[PDB]
């Protein structure tokens, strides 16, 4: 989980999700590629 | 019919006995050893054409013995004795290095009757032409 202000889909498996306010990226193929706006 | 077990498509010149410097460890890796490519590979060479890179099927078996039926020599190597030139791509259409005639191409085509799955000879000819063009030899009409 990375700390960002820009949460971009870096690959096809990356998935943008808004979990009750906080904008997040989760990638199925890559454990690195998951991100968080904070 | 049996499903694909293991195969490694790696072959060099047919005239050379026992491929070992260029291919190396690849053919003798899974089942069939290194030494079974000088008695079996040269047996089918003598009948058709010598000193030319022709691919052969290497379906590996648990019983050590492998089935092989070689195809008719590639378009890349047949278009060298009739083509006139040796060098190909890198700078192919940038500057003309060789010359190819349609009749010659057609002639080249007719040999690969069993190699290619095709109903007509014209189609084969045009495929050959295409291959030549890809290589870097501009078709003369």
């Amino acid at each position: 989980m990375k700390v960002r202000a820009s949460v971009k889909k870096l690959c096809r498996n990356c998935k943008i999700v808004k979990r009750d306010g906080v904008i997040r990226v989760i990638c199925s193929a890559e454990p690195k590629h998951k991100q968080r706006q904070g | 019919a049996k499903k694909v077990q293991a195969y490694v498509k790696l072959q060099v010149a047919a005239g050379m006995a026992n491929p070992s410097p260029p291919v190396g460890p690849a053919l003798g890796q899974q089942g069939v050893n290194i030494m079974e490519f000088c008695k079996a590979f040269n047996a089918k060479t003598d009948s058709i054409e010598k000193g030319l890179p022709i691919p052969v099927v290497i379906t590996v078996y648990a019983d050590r013995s492998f089935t092989f039926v070689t195809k008719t020599p590639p378009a890349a190597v047949l278009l060298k004795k009739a083509a006139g030139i040796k060098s190909g791509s890198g700078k192919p259409n940038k500057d003309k290095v060789g010359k190819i005639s349609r009749a010659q191409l057609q002639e080249i085509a007719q040999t690969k009757a069993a190699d290619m799955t095709g109903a007509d000879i014209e189609a084969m000819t045009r495929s050959i032409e295409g291959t030549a063009r890809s290589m870097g030899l501009v078709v003369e009409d």
Partner: protein
Amino acid sequence: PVNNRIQDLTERSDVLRGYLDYDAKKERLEEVNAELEQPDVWNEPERAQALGKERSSLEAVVDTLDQMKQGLEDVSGLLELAVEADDEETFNEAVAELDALEEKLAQLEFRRMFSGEYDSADCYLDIQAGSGGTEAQDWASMLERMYLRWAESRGFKTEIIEESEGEVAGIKSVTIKISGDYAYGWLRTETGVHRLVRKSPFDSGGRRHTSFSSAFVYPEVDDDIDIEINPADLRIDVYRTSGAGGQHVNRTESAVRITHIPTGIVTQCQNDRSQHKNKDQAMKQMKAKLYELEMQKKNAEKQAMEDNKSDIGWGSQIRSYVLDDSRIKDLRTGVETRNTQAVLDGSLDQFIEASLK
């Protein structure tokens, strides 16, 4: 005339061959191919990487010198048929593939002058005169002249930069720049102290003299003045100035210390009143100190390199210029030249290849 040149070329190749170890590198190649032909060789990547490329590099030598022996003969045979039958084309085809062989030889010759980080770069040489007082000076000038002649013969721009002439006659110290294609390659192997034996003209009693003069050859390096130190490498810290000033200096963070993070070198300043002047002045000072650190490390590396060369000792005495008996014996050459007058007129071709070997 052409066929005798072929034989000369063959001879040249053969002499090259022994040093490059045709009988040992072919054996070395046998053992690599014994392991790497087996599919289970990538258990160890670390060793296999170092050997994989090595074998590839050694195949381009042994097999090519076998394609040379195989080549020369074929071309000769090609030549023979044509001349006998008065055919012309084959004559031309016999010369053109002999032509390839010279290039190959050059490449192998180039491979001797390729070994090393600095080869094609600009070249400098310092001919320092010995302890002779006058004889040494005389020798040095001679050496300089020889070098000049060599430069002329090869085809290079020869630029005398510093020239301190002898107290009576000759040269005390001379630095010459020699620019061009692989200029340092020919001259790197010339580096050393030159033993001159001579019946001197300056001695009133006409004594015989063993004289010495260094010819230290070194290449021109890239300038590399200072690396631009990025803010991620600097550690900037501010504090109070020590001393007098009532309420003002007691309540300023004007003083600054900059520390280079990986090094540990620390530069402080508490001179000016402003923080911002100090920061840039102590950075200017920090930069200065970094240069010293980098200058000092380069100097110590140089020192250590030269103390290796020092421990060679008497090996620095390279080429004995026995002028009192005409013959010249270089330590690595093992051959004598009876024409001193050609040697002095810049014909060291007999000495470069042997010393490089």
